[PDB]
Amino acid sequence: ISSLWIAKTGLDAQQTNMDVIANNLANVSTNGFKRQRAVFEDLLYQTIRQPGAQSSEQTTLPSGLQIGTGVRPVATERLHSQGNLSQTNNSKDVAIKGQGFFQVMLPDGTSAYTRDGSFQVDQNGQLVTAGGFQVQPAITIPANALSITIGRDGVVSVTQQGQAAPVQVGQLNLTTFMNDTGLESIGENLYIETQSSGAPNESTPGLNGAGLLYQGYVETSNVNVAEELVNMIQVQRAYEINSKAVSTTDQMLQKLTQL
Amino acid sequence: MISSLWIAKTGLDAQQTNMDVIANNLANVSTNGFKRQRAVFEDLLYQTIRQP
Amino acid sequence: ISSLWIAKTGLDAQQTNMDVIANNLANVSTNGFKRQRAVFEDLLYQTIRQPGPSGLQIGTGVRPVATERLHSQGNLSQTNNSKDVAIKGQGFFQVMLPDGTSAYTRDGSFQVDQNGQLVTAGGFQVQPAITIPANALSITIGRDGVVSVTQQGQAAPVQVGQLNLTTFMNDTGLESIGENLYIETQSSGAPNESTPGLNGAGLLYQGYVETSNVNVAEELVNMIQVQRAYEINSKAVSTTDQMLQKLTQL
Amino acid sequence: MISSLWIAKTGLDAQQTNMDVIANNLANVSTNGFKRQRAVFEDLLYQTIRQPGAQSSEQTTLPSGLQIGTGVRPVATERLHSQGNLSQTNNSKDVAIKGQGFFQVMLPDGTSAYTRDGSFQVDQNGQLVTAGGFQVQPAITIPANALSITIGRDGVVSVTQQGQAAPVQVGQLNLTTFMNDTGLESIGENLYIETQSSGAPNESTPGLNGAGLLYQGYVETSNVNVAEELVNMIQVQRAYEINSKAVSTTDQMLQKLTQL
Amino acid sequence: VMLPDGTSAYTRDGSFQVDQNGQLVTAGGFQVQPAITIPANALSITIGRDGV
Amino acid sequence: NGNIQVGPTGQLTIQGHPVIGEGGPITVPEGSEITIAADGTISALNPGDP
Helix, strand or coil: CHHHHHHHHHHHHHHHHHHHHHHHHHCCCCCCCCCEEEEEEECCEEECCCCCCECCCCCECCCCCEEECCEEEEEEEECCCCCCEEECCCCCCEEEECCCEEEEECCCCCEEEECCCCEEECCCCEEEECCCCEECCCCECCCCEEEEEECCCCEEEEEECCCCCCEEEEECCEEECCCHHHCEEECCCEEECCCCCCCCEEECCCCCCCCEEEECEEECCCCCHHHHHHHHHHHHHHHHHHHHHHHHHHHHHHHHHCC | CCHHHHHHHHHHHHHHHHHHHHHHHHHCCCCCCCCCCCCCCCCCCCCCCCCC | CCHHHHHHHHHHHHHHHHHHHHHHHHCCCCCCCECEEEEEEECCCEECCCCCCCCCEECCCEEEEEEEECCCCCCEEECCCCCCEEEECCCEEEEECCCCCEEEECCCCEEECCCCEEEECCCCEECCCCECCCCCCEEEECCCCEEEEECCCCCCCEEEEECCEEECCCCCCCEEECCCEEECCCCCCCCEEECCCCCCCCEEEECEEECCECCHHHHHHHHHHHHHHHHHHHHHHHHHHHHHHHHHHC | CCHHHHHHHHHHHHHHHHHHHHHHHHHCCCCECCCCEEEEEEECCCEEEECCCCEEECCEECCCCEEECCCEEEEEEEECCCCCCEEECCCCCCEEEECCCEEEEECCCCCEEEECCCCEEECCCCEEEECCCCEECCCCECCCCCCCEEECCCCEEEECCCCCCCCEEEEECCEEECCCHHHCEEECCCEEECCCCCCCCEEECCCCCCCCEEEECEEEECCCCHHHHHHHHHHHHHHHHHHHHHHHHHHHHHHHHHHC | CECCCCCECCCCCCCEEECCCCEEEECCCCECCCCCECCCCCCCCCCCCCCC | CCCCEECCCCEEECCCCECECCCCECECCCCCEEEECCCCCEEEECCCCC
């Protein structure tokens, strides 16, 4: 019967809503995470009487008979707002303030883009991210380093013992996209470009609408904890209501069959 | 046995590991030549219903 | 004599649907299980010509034509074990049956036999034959198939084997046997083996195990629907029996 | 009769076994040197009505045949052989073991068992025995006039006297290593015995050939994560309820067919 | 759908699979006449609102 | 009468009489499982064979 096939879609929509809520609440402490919200959509409609049909020679129907089919989760989106900064007092932690993504060379040869800035140096001195992947501009740090300085410009400078001025080792460019909401979000806290996302535009920080870089800070996730509790209350109550609808349809059919 | 349950389980495990490293740092606060620890998390795989 | 067999086919179809629903609900915790859905289609139509547009086609029952597995991606559960492996994307581990043939699996839960090889829970050994040595201080499986074991007194870990995985151009056609194993058929394409992360192969996560893609709410709604359909379809048999008895009374 | 009834019965039995494993893990949460265990499931055979890949017609094949399931069964259980947390008891005759290995004890009937619970006493004869009376295989014998007992990281046990300053060596507390620790057969009182799955045990001194060290005065705690156990309890309860509902639905439809 | 006899039969049920060549077929082996070919090593298959 | 039967020597036969196709009556492998296509093709699978 139709009502069962409608309430089933309702239940599935509520389940997906609960899933995205739980995913947002799970990695509340993941640095550089963007909250996700789901947008639903009603399904097709069955038109029994066509609205606007000639009801007589003069009058016409004001609104015909249409019956809904259910709801369908059309999409989900990520809010690219600015999360709060947290201080870690680590010389190699970079927080991006504004817009942009660090470019990373994946082992296969492709390129990914990420926002979580927390870097180390491998045995060869190259600057890599937590996970082994290396930053694309290939910032190399000598073995005789005393400190690492990353100014808001994006230029990485290193000091050596018995020297007057530090020696620049490279520039830490960053890429911005026309539409960062369209980036395909692979695991390991990485995004890759798609057709919906524009072609990457690489630039130095602080120019052409790019963000700035702060050294020693990490960008926290922009997950609003208070909103999740009320969202959970709403999701649970909606699920209970749809369950009651299914129960009513079942009772109706059970009465019908034993006729 | 629903996806939300497993997601919440992973979140609980992550918070437990965070508390573990916090307690470890607090325990040996008076140990000579000791360096603190900080855990870094990443999100797991994403399953795509409609391709972006 | 007329609607009895049509209603019998309907009852049988609903029974088969209930069977697949119950089978899906049974292994809600089996690792790497893929849910199945059955599809039906009506049988041949008989036609009665008009004397001398024509029409008047009287149908008959329905039969189940196929059942398909939704080869989707399941959620990952954490076990902390150092030998459990989970697939990220598409691909099957290749295992060898003791007979000599080859099977393929999604369930990553590996152990080590007395000889140091890598086997699945049941004794079947992974075909590339990873041979973990003794005194293995720790074993790590990365994104690729490289399995590295660290040994005491050794700075650089020694690579002990490569864990390739196979992919098919049609995985829905794989024949299913017990203990989470698949055997290639004619419908399924010839297997192609590749390193993880290349040519459409997935990645390998260490310490995680793939869950099953079973939606309990969908199963409950289908259960209500199939029970009501069966209960209604019994009425056709009841009414046909009553009218046939009334006919034969005179 | 109806296959779905037996399928749901198998599901209920699997959930019952899972709950039994969870309850066993929770019961001995305070047992020293206990390893949590996880059950692994698998599905039974499949009834194939139409053979996949068969010729649907000329120059065409069936994309996927008709196969119906039969149920599930638990295939095996695996113990997570990882390192537990150490807790201090200040007692000088308790040793925890760091890394891999098992202490070897001699069962009274003459066989040998391998344990990991380190908390020993001294019998009336002066031998070092486990909590339960089984004597440790290397046969450590402590003399009478003992002030303090020192068990080093490398497994050499010595005892101090009153007169002479230098402590006297008493024995070596070497430990055994296996190819497959998970394959050991488990019995009561925290004991494991060698099976065919686990390779032949090889003894070694602690700290060599990948064998762990000894910490005197500490006991290894069970590696049970209660937070996981509670969520697993919720999961198994819900799955049991779902399977019971399936049984009820099958009974209802069978009754309706009967009333015909 | 292209029948084995060579004639064309028209259907409404949407449930499609792929055979050993990647050709799009119905559940039963019959091929869709436009003969959409899905290559191997394909990450995802999308069927948009139109017939693309 | 579509109730096809197979004898001990792989002889396809409806009740009493053998079934014929191209040429004489058709014979199949000794104990292979038989699948009937939608156009009359007979697929034979020897048991145990992949």
